[PDB]
Coordinates of C-alpha atoms in Angstrom, one line a residue:
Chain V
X21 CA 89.8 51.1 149.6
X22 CA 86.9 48.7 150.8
X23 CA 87.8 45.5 152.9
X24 CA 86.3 42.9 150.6
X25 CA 87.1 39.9 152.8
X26 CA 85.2 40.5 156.3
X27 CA 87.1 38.5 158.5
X28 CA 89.9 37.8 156.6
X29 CA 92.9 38.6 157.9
X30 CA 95.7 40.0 156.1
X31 CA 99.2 38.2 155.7
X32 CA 102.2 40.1 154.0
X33 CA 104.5 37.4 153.6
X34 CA 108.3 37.4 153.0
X35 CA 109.4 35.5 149.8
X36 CA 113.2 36.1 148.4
X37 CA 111.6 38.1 145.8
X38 CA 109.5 40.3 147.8
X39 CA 106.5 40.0 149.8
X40 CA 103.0 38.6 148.6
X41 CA 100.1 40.3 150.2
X42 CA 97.3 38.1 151.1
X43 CA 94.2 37.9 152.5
X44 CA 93.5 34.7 154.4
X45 CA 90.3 33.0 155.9
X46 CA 88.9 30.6 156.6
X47 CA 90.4 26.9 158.0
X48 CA 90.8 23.6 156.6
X49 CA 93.1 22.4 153.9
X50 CA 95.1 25.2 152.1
X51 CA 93.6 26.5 149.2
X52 CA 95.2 29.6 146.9
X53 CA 93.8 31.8 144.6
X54 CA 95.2 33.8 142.5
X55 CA 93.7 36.7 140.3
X56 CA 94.7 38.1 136.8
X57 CA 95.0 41.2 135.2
X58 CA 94.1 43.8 135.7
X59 CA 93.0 42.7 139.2
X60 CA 94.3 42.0 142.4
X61 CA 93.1 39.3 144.9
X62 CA 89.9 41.2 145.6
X63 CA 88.4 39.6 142.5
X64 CA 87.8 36.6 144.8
X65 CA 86.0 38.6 147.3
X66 CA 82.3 37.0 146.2
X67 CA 83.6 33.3 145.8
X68 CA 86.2 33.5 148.9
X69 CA 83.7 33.1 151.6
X70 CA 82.3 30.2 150.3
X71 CA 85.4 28.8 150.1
X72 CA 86.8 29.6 153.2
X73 CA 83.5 27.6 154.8
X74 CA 85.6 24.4 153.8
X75 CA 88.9 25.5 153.3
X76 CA 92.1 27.6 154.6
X77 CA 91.6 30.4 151.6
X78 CA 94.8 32.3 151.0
X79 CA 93.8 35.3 148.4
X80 CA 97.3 36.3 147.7
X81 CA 98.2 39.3 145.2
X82 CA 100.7 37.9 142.4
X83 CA 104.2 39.4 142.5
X84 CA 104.1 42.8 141.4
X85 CA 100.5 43.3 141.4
X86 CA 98.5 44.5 144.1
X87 CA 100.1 45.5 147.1
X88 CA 102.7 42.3 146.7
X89 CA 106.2 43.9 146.4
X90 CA 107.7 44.4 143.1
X91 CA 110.6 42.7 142.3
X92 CA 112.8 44.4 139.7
X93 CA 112.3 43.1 136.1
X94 CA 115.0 42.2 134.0
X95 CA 115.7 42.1 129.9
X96 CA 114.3 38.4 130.3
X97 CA 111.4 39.5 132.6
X98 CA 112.3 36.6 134.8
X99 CA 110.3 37.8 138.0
X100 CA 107.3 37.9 135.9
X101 CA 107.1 34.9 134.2
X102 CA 105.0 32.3 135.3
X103 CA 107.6 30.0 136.4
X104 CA 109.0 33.0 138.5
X105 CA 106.2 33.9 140.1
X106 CA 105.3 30.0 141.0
X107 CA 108.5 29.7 142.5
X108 CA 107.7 33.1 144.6
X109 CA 104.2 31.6 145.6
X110 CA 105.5 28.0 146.6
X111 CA 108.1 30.2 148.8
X112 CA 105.2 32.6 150.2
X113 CA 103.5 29.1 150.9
X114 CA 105.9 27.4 152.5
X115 CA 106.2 30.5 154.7
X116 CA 102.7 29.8 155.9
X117 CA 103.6 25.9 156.2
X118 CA 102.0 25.2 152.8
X119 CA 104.0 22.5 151.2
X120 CA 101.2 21.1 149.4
X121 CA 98.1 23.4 148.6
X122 CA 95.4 23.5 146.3
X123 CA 95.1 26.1 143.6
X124 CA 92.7 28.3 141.8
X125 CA 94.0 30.8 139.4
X126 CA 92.4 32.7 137.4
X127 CA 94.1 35.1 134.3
X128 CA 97.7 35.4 134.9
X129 CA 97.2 33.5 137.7
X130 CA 95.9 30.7 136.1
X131 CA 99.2 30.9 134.2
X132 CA 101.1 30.9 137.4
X133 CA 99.0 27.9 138.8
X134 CA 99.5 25.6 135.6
X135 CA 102.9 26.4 135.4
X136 CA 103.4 25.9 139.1
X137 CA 101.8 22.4 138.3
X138 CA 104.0 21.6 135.7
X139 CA 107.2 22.6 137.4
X140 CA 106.2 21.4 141.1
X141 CA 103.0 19.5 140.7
X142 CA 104.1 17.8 144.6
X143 CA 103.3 21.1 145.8
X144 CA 99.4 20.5 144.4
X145 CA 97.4 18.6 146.0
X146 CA 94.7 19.9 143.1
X147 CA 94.3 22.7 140.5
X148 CA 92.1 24.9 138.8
X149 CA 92.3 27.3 136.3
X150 CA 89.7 29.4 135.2
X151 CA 89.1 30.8 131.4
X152 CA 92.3 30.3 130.2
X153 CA 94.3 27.9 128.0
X154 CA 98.1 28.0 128.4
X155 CA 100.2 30.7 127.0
X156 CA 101.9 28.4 124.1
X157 CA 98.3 27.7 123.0
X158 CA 96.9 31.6 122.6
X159 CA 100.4 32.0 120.8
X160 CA 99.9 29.4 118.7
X161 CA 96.3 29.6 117.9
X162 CA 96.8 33.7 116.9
X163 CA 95.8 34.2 113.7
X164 CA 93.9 37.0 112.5
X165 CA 90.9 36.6 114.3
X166 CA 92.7 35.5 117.9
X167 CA 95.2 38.8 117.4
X168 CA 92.2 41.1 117.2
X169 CA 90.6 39.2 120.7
X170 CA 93.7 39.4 122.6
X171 CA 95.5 42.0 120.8
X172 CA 96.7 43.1 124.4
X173 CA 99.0 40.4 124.5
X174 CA 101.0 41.6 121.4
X175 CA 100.3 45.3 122.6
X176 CA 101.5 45.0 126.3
X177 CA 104.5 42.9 125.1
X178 CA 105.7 45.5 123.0
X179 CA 109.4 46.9 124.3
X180 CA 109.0 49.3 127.3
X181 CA 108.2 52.1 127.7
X182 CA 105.9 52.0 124.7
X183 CA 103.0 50.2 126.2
X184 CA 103.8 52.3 129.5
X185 CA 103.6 55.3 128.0
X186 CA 100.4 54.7 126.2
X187 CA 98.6 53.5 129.6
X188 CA 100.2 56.7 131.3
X189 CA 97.9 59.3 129.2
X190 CA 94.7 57.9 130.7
X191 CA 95.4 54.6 132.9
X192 CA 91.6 54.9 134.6
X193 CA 90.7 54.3 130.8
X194 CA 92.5 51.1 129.8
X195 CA 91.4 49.3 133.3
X196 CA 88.1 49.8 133.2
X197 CA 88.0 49.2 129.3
X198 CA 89.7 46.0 129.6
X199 CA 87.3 44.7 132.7
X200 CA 84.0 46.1 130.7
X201 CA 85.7 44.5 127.6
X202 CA 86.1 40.6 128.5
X203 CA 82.4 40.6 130.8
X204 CA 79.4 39.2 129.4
X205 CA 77.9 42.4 129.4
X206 CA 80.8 44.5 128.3
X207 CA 80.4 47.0 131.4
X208 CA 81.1 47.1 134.5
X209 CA 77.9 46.1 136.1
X210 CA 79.2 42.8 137.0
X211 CA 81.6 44.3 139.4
X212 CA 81.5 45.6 142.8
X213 CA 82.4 49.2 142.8
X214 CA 84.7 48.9 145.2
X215 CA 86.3 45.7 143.7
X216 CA 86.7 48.0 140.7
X217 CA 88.3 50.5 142.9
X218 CA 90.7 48.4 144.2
X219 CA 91.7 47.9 140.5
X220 CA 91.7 51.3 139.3
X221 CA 93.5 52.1 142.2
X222 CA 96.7 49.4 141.5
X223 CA 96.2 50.4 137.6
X224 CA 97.3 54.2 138.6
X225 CA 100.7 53.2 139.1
X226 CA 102.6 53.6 136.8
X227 CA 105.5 51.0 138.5
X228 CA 102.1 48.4 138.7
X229 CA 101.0 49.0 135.2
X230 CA 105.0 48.4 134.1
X231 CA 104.9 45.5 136.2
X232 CA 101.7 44.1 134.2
X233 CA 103.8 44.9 131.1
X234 CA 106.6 43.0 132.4
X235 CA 104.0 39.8 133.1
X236 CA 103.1 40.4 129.6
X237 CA 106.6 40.2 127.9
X238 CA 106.9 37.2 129.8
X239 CA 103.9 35.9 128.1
X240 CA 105.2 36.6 124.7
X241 CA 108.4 35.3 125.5
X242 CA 109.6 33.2 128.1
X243 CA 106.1 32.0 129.7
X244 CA 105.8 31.0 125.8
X245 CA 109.1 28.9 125.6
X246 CA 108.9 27.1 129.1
X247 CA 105.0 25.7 127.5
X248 CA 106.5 25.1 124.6
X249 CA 109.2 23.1 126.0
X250 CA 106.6 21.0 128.1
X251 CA 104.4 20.5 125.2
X252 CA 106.9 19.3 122.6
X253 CA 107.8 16.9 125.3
X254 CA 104.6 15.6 125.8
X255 CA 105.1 16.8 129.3
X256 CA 101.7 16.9 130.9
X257 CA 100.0 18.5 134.6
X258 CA 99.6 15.2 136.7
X259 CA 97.9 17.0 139.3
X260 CA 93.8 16.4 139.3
X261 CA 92.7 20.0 137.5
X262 CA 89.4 21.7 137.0
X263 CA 89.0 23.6 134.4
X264 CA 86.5 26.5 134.2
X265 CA 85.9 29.3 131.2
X266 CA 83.4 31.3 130.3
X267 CA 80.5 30.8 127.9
X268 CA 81.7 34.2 126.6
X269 CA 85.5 34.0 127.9
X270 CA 88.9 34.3 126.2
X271 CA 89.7 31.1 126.6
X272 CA 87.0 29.6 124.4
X273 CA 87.3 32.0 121.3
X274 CA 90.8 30.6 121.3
X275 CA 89.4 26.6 121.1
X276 CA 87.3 23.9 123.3
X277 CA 88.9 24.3 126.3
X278 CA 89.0 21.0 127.6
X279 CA 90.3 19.5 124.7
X280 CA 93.3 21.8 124.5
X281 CA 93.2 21.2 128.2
X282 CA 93.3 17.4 127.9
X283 CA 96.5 17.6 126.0
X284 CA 97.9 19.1 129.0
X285 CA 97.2 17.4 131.6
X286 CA 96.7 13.9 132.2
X287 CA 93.8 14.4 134.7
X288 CA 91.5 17.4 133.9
X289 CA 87.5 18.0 134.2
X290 CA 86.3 21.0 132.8
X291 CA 82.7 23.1 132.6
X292 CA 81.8 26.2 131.1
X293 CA 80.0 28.5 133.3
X294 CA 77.9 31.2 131.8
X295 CA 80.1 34.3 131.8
X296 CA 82.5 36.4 130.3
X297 CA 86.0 36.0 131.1
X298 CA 85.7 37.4 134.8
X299 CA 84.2 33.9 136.4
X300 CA 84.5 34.8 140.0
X301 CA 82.8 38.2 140.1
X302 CA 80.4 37.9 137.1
X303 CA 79.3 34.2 138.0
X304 CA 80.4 33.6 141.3
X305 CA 78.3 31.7 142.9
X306 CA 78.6 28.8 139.7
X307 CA 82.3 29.5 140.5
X308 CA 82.2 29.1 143.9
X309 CA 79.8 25.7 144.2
X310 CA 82.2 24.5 141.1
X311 CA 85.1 25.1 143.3
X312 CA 83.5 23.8 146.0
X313 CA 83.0 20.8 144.5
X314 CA 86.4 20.0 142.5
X315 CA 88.6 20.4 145.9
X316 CA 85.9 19.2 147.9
X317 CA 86.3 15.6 146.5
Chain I
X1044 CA 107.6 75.2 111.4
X1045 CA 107.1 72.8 108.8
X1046 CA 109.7 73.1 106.1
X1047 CA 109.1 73.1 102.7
X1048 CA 111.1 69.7 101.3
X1049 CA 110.0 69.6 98.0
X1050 CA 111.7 73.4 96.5
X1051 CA 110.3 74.0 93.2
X1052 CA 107.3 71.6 93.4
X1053 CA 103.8 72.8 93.0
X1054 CA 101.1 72.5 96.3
X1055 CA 98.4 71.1 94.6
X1056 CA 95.0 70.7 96.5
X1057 CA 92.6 68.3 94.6
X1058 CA 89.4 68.3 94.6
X1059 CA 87.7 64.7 94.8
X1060 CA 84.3 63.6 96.0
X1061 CA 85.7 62.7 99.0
X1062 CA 87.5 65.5 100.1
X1063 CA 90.8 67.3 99.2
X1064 CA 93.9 65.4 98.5
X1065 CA 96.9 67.6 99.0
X1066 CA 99.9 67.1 97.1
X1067 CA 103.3 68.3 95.9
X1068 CA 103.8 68.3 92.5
X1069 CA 106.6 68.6 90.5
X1070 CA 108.6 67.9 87.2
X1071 CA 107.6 67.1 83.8
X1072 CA 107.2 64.0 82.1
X1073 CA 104.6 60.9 82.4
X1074 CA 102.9 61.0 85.9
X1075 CA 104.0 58.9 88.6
X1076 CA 102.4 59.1 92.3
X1077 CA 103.3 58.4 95.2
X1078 CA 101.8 57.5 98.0
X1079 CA 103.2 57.3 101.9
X1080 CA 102.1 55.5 104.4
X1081 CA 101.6 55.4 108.1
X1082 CA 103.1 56.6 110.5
X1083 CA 104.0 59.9 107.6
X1084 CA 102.8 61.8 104.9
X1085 CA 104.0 62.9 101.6
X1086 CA 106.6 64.3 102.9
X1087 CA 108.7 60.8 103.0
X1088 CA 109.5 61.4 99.7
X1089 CA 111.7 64.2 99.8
X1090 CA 114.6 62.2 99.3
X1091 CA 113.5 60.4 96.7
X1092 CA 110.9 62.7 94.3
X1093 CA 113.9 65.4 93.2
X1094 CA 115.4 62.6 91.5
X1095 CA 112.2 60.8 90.1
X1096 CA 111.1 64.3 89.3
X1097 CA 113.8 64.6 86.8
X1098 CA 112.3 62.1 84.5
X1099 CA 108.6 62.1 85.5
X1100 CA 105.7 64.6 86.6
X1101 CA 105.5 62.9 90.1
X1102 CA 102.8 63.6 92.9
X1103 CA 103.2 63.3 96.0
X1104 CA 100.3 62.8 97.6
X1105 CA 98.9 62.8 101.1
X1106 CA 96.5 60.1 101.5
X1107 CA 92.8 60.4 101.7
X1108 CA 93.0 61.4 105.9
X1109 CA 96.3 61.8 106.2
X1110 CA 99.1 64.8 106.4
X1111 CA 96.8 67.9 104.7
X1112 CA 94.5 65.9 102.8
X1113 CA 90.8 66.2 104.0
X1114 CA 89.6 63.3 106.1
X1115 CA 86.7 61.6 105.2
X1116 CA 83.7 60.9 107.5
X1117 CA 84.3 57.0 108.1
X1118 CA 81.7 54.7 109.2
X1119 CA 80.8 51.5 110.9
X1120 CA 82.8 49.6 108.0
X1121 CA 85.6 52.6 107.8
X1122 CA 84.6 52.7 104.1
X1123 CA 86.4 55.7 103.4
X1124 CA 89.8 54.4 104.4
X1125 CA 89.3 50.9 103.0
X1126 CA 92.1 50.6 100.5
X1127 CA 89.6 50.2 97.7
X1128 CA 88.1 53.7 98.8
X1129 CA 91.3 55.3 98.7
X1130 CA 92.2 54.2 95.4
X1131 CA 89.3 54.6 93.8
X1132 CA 89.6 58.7 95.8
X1133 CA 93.4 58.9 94.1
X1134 CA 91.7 57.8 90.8
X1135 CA 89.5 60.3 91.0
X1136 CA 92.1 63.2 91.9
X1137 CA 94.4 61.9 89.3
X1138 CA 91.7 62.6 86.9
X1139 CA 91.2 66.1 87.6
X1140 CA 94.7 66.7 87.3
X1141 CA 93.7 64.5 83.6
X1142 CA 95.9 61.3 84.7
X1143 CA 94.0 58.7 84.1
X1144 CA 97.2 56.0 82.8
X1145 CA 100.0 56.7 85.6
X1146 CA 102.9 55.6 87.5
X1147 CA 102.2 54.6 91.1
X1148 CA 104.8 53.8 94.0
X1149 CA 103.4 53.5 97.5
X1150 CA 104.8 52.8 100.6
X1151 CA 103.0 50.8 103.7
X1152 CA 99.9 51.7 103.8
X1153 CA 100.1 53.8 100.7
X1154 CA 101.4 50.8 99.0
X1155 CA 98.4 49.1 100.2
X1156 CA 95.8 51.7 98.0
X1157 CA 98.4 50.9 95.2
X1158 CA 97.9 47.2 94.7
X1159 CA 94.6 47.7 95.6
X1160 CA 94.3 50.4 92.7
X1161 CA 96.2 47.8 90.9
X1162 CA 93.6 44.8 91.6
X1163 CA 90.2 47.1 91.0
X1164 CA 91.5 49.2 88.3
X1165 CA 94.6 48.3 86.7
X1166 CA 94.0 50.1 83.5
X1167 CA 94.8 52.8 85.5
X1168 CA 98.3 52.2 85.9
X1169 CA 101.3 51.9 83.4
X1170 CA 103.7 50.3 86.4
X1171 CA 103.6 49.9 90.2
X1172 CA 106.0 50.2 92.7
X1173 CA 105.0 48.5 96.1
X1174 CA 107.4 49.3 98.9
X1175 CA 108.1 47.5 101.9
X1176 CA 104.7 45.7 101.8
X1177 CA 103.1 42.5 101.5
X1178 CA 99.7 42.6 101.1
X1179 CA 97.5 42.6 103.5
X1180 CA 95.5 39.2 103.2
X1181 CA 99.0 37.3 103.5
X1182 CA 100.2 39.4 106.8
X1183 CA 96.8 38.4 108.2
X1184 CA 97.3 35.3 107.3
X1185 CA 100.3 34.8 107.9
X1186 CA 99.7 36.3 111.7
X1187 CA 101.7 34.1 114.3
X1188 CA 103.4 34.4 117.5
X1189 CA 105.7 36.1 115.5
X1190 CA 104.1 38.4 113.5
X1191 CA 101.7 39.1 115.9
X1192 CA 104.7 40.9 117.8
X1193 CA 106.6 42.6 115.5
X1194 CA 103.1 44.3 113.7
X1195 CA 101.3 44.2 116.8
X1196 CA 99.8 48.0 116.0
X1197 CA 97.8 45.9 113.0
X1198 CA 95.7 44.7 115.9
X1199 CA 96.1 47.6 118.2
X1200 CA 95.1 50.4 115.9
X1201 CA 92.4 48.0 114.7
X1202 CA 90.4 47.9 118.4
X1203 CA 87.2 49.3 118.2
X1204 CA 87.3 53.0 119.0
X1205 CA 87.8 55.0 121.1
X1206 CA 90.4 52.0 122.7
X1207 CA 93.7 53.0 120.0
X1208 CA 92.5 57.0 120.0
X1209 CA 92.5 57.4 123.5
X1210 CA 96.2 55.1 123.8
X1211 CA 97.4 57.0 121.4
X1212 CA 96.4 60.4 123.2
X1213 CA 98.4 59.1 125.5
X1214 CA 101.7 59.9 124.7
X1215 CA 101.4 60.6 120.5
X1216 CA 104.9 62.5 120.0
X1217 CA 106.6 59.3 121.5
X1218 CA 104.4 56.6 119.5
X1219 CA 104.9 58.7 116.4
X1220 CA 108.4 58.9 117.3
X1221 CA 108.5 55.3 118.4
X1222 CA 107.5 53.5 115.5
X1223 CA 109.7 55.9 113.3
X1224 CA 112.5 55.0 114.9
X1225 CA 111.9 51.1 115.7
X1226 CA 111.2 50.3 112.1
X1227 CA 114.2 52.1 110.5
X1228 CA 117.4 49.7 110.5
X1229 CA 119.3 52.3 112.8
X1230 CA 116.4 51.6 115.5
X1231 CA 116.4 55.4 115.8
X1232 CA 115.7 58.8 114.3
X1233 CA 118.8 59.4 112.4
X1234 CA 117.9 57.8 109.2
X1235 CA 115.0 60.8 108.9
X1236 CA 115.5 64.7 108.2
X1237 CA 114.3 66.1 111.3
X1238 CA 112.4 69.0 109.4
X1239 CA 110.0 65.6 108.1
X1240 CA 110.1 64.1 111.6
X1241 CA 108.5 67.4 112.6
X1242 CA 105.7 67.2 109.7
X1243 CA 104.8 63.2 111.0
X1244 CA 104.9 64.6 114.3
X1245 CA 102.9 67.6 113.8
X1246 CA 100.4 65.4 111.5
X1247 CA 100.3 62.9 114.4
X1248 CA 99.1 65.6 117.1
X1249 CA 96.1 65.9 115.5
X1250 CA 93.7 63.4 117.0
X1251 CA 91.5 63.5 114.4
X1252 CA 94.1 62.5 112.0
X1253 CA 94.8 59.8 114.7
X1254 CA 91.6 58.5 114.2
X1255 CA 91.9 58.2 110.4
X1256 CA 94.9 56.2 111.0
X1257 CA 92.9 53.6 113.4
X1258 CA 90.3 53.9 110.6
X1259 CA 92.4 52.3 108.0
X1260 CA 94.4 50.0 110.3
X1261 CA 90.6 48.8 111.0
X1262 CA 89.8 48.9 107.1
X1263 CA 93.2 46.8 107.3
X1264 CA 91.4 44.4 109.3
X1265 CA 88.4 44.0 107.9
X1266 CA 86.9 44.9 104.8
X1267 CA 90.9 45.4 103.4
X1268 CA 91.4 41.6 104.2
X1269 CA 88.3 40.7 102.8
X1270 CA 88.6 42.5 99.6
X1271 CA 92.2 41.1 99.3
X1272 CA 90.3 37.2 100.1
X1273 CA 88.5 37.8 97.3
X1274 CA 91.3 38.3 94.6
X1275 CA 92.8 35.2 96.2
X1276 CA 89.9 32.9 95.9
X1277 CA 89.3 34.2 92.8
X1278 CA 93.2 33.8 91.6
X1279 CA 93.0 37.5 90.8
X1280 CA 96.6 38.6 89.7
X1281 CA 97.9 42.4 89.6
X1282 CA 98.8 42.4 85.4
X1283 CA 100.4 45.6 85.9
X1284 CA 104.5 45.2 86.1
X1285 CA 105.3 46.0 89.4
X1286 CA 108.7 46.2 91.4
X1287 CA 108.2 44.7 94.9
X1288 CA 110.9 46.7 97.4
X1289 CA 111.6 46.1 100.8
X1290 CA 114.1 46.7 103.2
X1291 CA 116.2 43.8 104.3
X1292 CA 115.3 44.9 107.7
X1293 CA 111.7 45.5 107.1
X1294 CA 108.5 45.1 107.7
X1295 CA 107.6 42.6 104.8
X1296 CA 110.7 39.8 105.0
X1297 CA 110.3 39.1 108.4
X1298 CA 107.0 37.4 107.3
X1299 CA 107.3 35.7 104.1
X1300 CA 110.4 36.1 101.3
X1301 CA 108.4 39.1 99.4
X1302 CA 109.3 38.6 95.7
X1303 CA 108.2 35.1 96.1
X1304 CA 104.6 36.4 97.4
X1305 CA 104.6 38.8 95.0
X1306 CA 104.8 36.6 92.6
X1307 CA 101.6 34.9 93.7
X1308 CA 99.6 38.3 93.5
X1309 CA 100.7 39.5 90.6
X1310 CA 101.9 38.4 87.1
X1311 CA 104.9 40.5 86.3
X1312 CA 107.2 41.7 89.6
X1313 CA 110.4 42.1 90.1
X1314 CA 112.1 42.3 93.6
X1315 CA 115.0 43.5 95.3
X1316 CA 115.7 44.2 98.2
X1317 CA 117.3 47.4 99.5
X1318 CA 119.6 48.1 102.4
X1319 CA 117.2 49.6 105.2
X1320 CA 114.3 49.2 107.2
X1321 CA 110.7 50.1 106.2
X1322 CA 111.3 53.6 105.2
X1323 CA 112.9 52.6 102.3
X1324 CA 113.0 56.2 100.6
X1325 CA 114.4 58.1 104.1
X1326 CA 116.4 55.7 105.5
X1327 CA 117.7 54.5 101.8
X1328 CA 117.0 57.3 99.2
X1329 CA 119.8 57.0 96.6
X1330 CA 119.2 52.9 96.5
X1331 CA 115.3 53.2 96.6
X1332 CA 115.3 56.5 94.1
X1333 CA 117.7 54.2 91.8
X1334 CA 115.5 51.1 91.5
X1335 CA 112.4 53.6 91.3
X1336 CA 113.3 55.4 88.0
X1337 CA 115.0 52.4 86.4
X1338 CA 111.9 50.4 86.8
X1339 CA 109.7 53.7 85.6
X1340 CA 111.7 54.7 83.1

């Protein structure tokens, strides 16, 4: 597997739920990204550098993706839901003397980070979130049109080992399906090779891809009833927050991102960049200066 | 291998312009088909056709695609596994066999073709039986968080190919098996005589016949929908008197109350519902064969 991240250095840091790998560069205040699915941390690898001109970058992999440790999963998927895995992230932080960090998420990670922000928003100093809208709103906006888009968050939340055992015939398949699916041009081209390597590579095991199923039955589930507690009480991200989609991203099939957006938090700019859902490596140098720019000032 | 569970019914292969629809045929009487549905063929009916078979000439039918009926060449719009198509193949069949006024009970998706049949050519029909459906406009519209979940393979099997084909290759026995099992009310196989298990198994191997079933789960999201929009919008109501069946844990009143739905597609229904989960006529024969001949006969 390529290094990605010249000059990063590489941080495996102890958490009480495992260790997050990360790749770290950079100096200046602390600023953590956080990739999706099905990626790992390399999907910063275009927009890092940029960043890590102005800023302490920490490119972590989430719990249970990547080479981050996976912690056990339970019937209530606890490690993987969103609230978890901020609480995982603010300890892999604090291990670094991080206390109060920006945060750019994109995917699942965007999950993590707006959930992090509405459980600890005194650990943010300011968020992003690129192409999504929160869990509760994808559930609550899926209708027949939205089920077919994102039918992998019905499918991958089915009971294990059914989605396992699907992914198990041919797991090279669904990864590479799934990143040529959401892109712009619905191939690969907009990846790096290697950066689709690194993908494949966590996608081939089989403990990752039940780890990914485990993030997703947290989305149908408990990710879903922690939003929908904060948005039946009106309970909104106070932390400044960009956020990004793509022209041609998941988010904004779903609705106008920055109106559902505004309804969440009380401080929130937004801009669509031209791209499919995979901002950082199919548009990254509009993700980067956008970046750039929101934690910059 | 495959057992014979129909002793003393005919094999019938029928010609249609379409392809070969294979069927079991037995008894004497007026004609009453049946139709299966997904994940089986015919073959679900063993339980049930002895007994119906004592007062009518029943058919059990594979559908067009499925079990050892011939599989159409879909296309782009999966014409040929639209429920209109289907019906409109069965019409024909049941005319070669000269039935041109007959009985029809269908089950999932062969319940689908039925009030389809019903809708395009009710003449056709003297009574229908739907069992364990809803049809498929109001799951669609009905689609929620909830729904989404619990029929998530309505959006799975309808990906574009080769996405569904090449899951299912993954592990077919245990899908096959899977959704057997997790939508009878025992949650596993013992509801079903293994000796059918083994023809929905052996049916499901094929990949081919795979396909056909992603072809009409994508008929059931598209032109299916659309064709049941239009009897909607146009107030279109079954005339036919039907029986509405469904399993009190099944697949249609998890969504919506189904007699009261019923009601709104069709102008003379009655409802009950029957001790089981969706397969009504395994997992509840005696119940399901009961309501079946006292509504036919």
């Amino acid at each position: 597997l390529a290094d990605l991240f010249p000059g990063f250095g590489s941080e495996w840091i102890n958490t009480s739920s495992g260790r997050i790998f990360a790749r770290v560069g950079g100096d200046g205040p602390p600023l953590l990204l956080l990739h999706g699915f099905p990626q790992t941390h390399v999907m910063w690898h275009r927009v890092a550098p940029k960043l890590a001109e102005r800023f302490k970058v920490i490119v972590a992999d989430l719990p249970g993706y990547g080479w981050s440790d996976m912690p056990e999963s339970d019937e209530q998927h606890t490690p993987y839901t969103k609230r978890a895995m901020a609480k995982q992230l603010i300890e892999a932080m604090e291990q670094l003397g991080h206390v109060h960090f920006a945060l750019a998420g994109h995917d699942r990670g965007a999950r993590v980070s707006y959930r992090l922000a509405l459980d600890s928003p005194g650990r943010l100093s300011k968020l992003a979130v690129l192409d999504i809208l929160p869990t509760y709103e994808y559930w609550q906006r899926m209708n027949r049109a939205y089920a077919l888009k994102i039918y992998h968050w019905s499918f991958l939340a089915q009971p294990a080992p059914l989605p396992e055992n699907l992914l198990g015939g041919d797991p090279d398949f669904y990864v590479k399906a799934k990143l040529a699916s959401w892109t712009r041009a619905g191939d690969l081209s907009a990846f790096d090779p290697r950066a689709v390597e690194h993908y494949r590579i966590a996608f081939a095991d089989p403990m990752r891809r039940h780890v990914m199923c485990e993030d997703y039955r947290a989305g149908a589930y408990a990710d879903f009833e922690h939003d929908k507690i904060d948005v039946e009480a009106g309970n909104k991200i106070p932390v400044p927050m960009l956020a990004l989609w793509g022209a041609s991203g998941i988010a904004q099939s779903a609705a106008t991102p920055l109106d559902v957006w505004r309804k969440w938090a009380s401080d929130v700019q937004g801009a669509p960049i031209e791209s499919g859902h995979f901002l950082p490596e199919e548009a990254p140098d509009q993700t980067a200066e956008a970046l750039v720019r929101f934690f910059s000032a």
